[PDB]
Structure formats: C-alpha cells, structure tokens
Structure 1
C-alpha cells in the first residue's frame, strides 16, 4: 500500500540527452536516430532574446557553428533546419541507444515525467501536470532549456514536452517535439500573461479514490448531488467543470471501491465549502490534482515497463 508522487523510470531517456552549443549559448538536446532536437533560441545571445528574428539569426549560422556533445563522443552536424520553435540538427551518427519513441501533444490535465538536465547530463526526475493554462510548475535553473518531458507505455517512450523558458512569474513554458508551444507563449524575453490557473477536477476525484483505496475514508458522507449542482459549486472555487467523459474515465475506480462517481462529487463539494479542518488526506492538507485516473490505477495495481 501507500501513495507517492511517482515518476517514470528515466533510463531510456538518459541515453538520448546531449549537450548542444552554438556560439556562446549551451543547452540540452534530444538525440533520436540521426537527428538532434533542441530549442531554437540556442542561436541567440542574451541581447537577442529581447526581440529575436530567428530566420535572420539562423541564416548567419552554418552546420559547423553547432557543437553537439554526446558525453565524450562527437556528432557532425551535416544538415540543419528550423521546425517552428525547435532546431533539427541532422548529425552523421544515429544514436545506438534510440528507444522505441513517439512524439505526442498532450492535453491540459495530463501528467508526465520531466528529466531535468544541465550541459546534457541528467540531474533529476519528477512528475508534474500540464496546468489548464498550459504552464507547468517545475524546477528549472539556467541551462535547463532542452530538458524533455515524457511518458512510457510498456516499451514506448512518448515525448510530449521540451522546456524553453521561465516566465517572469516563475512558471515554465515549452513546446511539443514539433516545436509548437503549449499555450499562447512565444520564445522571446517579454512580459507574457498566463491565463487563470484552475484546478483539475477529474484528477482530484481520482486522488480521492486513491485515498479510499489506502484507508482514508473520513471525507465520505451520506450526501449526494447532480452534475449541474456540483459544477456550479466547482466554478465558484476555480475548478474545471466535470463532463460525462470524465465520469466515464472514473468508471473503473468507481467499480473497485463501490463508490459512485456522483457520490464522490458530493464529498468533494463539502470539502470545498467547509475545508479540510486541519485534517489530511494521504498526508496532504490540500487537494491534489497532479494524479490522473490512469496514474492512480497503475500505482494501485503495479504496472511495469520494459
């Protein structure tokens, strides 16, 4: 038993991290097959970031202007191209440690593991969620740009995030592996507004099911409710509205615990209106929304990967 904010094993991703250097800037890149992916602002100086013209900046650069370090090995940049906000540095050698991989664009509320790297060397791993406003609340220092987020499906690594920058507010923004930013953010140093951050209701409900599975039952109550009545209370406390698709995803958890989804919603409603009263749920004094219904089932059943 027990419940922990669990990350995927990062072994398959560590073997893909390289150090990319262009001019004076150095950051991380993802080396799959014979292509290296990295944020395009590796070609920028600190002055350029204020208002960069990436096309003009990239035209001044040639293949031999990029230095790619795979630990102690050299990769020769033979071709270079810009796809949206990422650079695709075609190298001469294909990564022998390339895993079965796949590029995906996740949706808000989905969770993934981040491998924070500096100078192409792994530093740590943690799990986090894509906020509804398309930001992530991560842990990134200077030079962490290029670090990637990923999920693992048995034997496939699904790359979903590449880190690009820290907003003036301390939150983090990035792109998919095709270079398309999550959210309305651009890769320049300017004041950018992130939308209102709401709580991921479906994730909170999955977390409450995990608590029941692990022995925490005090928040259960004899009340019930409807979807509409619950939503109207949810939006007052900045909670994502619940749809029928959300109720469907929670089905398996409902069947394992014998607690109807709508009965759990009524319990959540009372928690929002009256609070926690200094008590805890799975060791937390706040409601946690960084566990998807899929994360809960896999940790409470023992899913593995190869």
Structure 2
C-alpha cells in the first residue's frame, strides 16, 4: 500500500548521457549506437539565441568543433547533420551501454520520467506530464538542455522528450528525439506565451481510483452523472473534456474497484464544486493529474523492468 509519484529507474538512460560543447556552449547529449543527439542551439551564444539562423550558424561548424565527452573520455565526431531542432553527431564508437530503444512522440496528458543532467552527469530523476498546452513543469537550470524524458517497457526505453527552452514564465519546452517541438514553441529567446494549462481529467480520475485502492475513500458520494453533464462542469473548471475513449481506458480500474467511471466523475464533480474542505487525498490537498491510468495499474500491480 501507499501511492507515490514514481519515476522509472534511470540506469539505462544514465548509460547514454554525454557532454557536448560547441565553442563556449556546453549542454547534454544522448549517445545511442554511434549517434549523439543534442539541441541544435549548442551552436548558439546567448546573443545568437535572440534571432538565430541555424543553417547559417552551422555552415561555420566542422566535425572537430563538436566536443563530445563520455565520462572523462573524448569521442571522435565523424559527421554531423541537423534534423529539425536537434543535431545528430555521428561518432566512431557505438555506445556499449545502448539499451533497446525507440523514439516516440507523446500526446498531451502522457507522463514520463526526466533525468536532469549537467555537463553530461545525472543530477536527479523525476516524473513529468506533457501539459495540454505542450509545456512541462520541470526543474531545469542553465546547462540542463539535452536532458531527456522517457518511459520504459520491460527492457526498452521509449525516448519522448529532449529539453531545449525555459519560457519567460519559467515553464519548459522541448522536442521529441526527431527534433520537432511539442507545441508551437521555437528555439529562439523571444516572446513565447503558453496557452491555458488545463487539468488532465482522465489522469485525475485514475488517481481517484488509486486513492480508493489505497483506502482513501472519504470523497466517494451517492451521485452519478453523464459525460455531457460532467463535461459542462469540467469546462467551467478548466479541466479537459472526458471522451468515451478515456472512459474505456479507465475500464480496468472501474472493474477492480467496482466504481462505475461515471460514478467517479460525479465524485470528481462534487470535489470541484465543494473543494477539499482542508482534507487530503493520498497526502495531496490538490487533485493530482500526473498519473495516467497505465501508471496507476503499473504501480498498483508492481510491474518491474
């Protein structure tokens, strides 16, 4: 029993982190097989970031201008190319610690672990969600760029995020490992405002199921609702609309607990309208939306890697 915001074990990804330096800029790279992936703004000064022309800045760069260090050992760069907002540095040595891996582009509401790194060295690991406005609320200092987000399926790492930018509002933006930003963000130091950070309703319901499984049941009420009724209330509280696809995904948690998804929706509606009245659920005074239904099943069933 107990329920914790849990990250994936980080060792498979620790084995892939390297340091990339171009001129005076140092950040992190991801070494898989004989390629190192890093943010293309490794080639920029802070001055360049105000209005960078990446193709033009890259013309002035050769393989030998990209310094890649793995532990305290220097890798030889034998090619480089830009793909969207990432650089791919081809090295002459395959990473011997390369795990089974995939590159995945996640949906808003999906969760992942971040291995925060500086100078190619791991600092810490924590669990993130992709917000509905395509930001993440991370913990990233200068030099964290190139840190990655991932999920593990037994022995296979699905890389879904690479860190590129802090917005002026202190939330975080980045790319998939093909270098496409999540959301409308660009790798330029310019006015970029996030849209509405809505609550991930299907994740809140999953976490309420987690709370019931763990004996935190005070919030269960006598009511039910319909998807349309529930959604009118959700929209008012800046919660994402719940779809039948979400109801279907919550089916196994419904089955375990014997609480119909719409009954849990009616419990959530009352919590939105009445608040917590100074009470907690799974030690939280807010409704938690950083656990997917898959996360809750996984943690409640003790799945290993």
Short-chain TM bin: over 0.9
User: 2-side partners of 1:234 and 1:165: how far apart?
Assistant: 31
Cα deviation 1:264-285 (Å, max 9, x = unaligned)? 0000000100111000101111
- Across the aligned residues of Structure 1 and Structure 2, the Cα RMSD in angstroms comes to 0.4
Deviation of 1:46 after TM superposition, in Å, equals: 1.4
Q: Give the 3-state SS of the residue equivalent to 2:301 in structure 1.
A: coil
Deviation of 1:72 after TM superposition, in Å, equals: 1.7
* Structure 1 gap ranges (5+): none
Cα deviation 1:24-75 (Å, max 9, x = unaligned)? 1000000000000000000001110000000000000111111000012121
User: 1-side partners of 2:60 and 2:72: how far apart?
Assistant: 28
Deviation of 1:4 after TM superposition, in Å, equals: 0.3
Q: Which runs of 4+ in 1 moved over 2 A?
A: none
Cα deviation 1:234-289 (Å, max 9, x = unaligned)? 10000000000000000000000000000000000001001110001011110000
User: 2-side partners of 1:123 and 1:218: how far apart?
Assistant: 38
Instruction: Give the corresponding residue for 1:47.
Output: 47
Cα deviation 1:121-167 (Å, max 9, x = unaligned)? 00000001000000000000000000000000011000000000100
Cα deviation 1:74-121 (Å, max 9, x = unaligned)? 211110000000000000111000000100000000000000000000
User: 2-side partners of 1:229 and 1:102: how far apart?
Assistant: 40
The number of residues matched between the two structures is: 305
Give the alignment's TM-score, normalised by structure 1: 0.99
* Structure 2 gap ranges (5+): none
Q: Give the 3-state SS of the residue equivalent to 2:90 in structure 1.
A: strand
User: 1-side partners of 2:20 and 2:90: how far apart?
Assistant: 12
Deviation of 1:226 after TM superposition, in Å, equals: 0.7
Deviation of 1:227 after TM superposition, in Å, equals: 0.7
Deviation of 1:10 after TM superposition, in Å, equals: 0.3
User: 1-side partners of 2:66 and 2:218: how far apart?
Assistant: 59
Greater mean alpha carbon deviation, residues 67-76 or residues 11-20: 67-76
Q: Give the 3-state SS of the residue equivalent to 1:300 in structure 2.
A: helix
